[PDB]
Design a protein around this ligand. Structure first.
Ligand SMILES: [Zn+2]
Length: 46
């Protein structure tokens, strides 16, 4: 039906809000901050 991730590796560091994959922690940490405030990029609306 709706294929997807049959067998894909994972990263040692993953976000908490968007759950994004990262190689280094430093890069991740800095990426976590961006997740602040409200409607930073734009609402989904569907
Ligand atoms: Zn994130």
């Amino acid at each position: 039906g709706s294929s997807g991730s049959s067998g894909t590796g994972e990263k040692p560091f993953e976000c908490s809000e968007c759950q994004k994959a990262f190689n280094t922690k430093s890069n991740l940490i800095v990426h976590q901050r961006t997740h602040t405030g409200e409607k930073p990029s734009g609402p989904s609306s569907g």
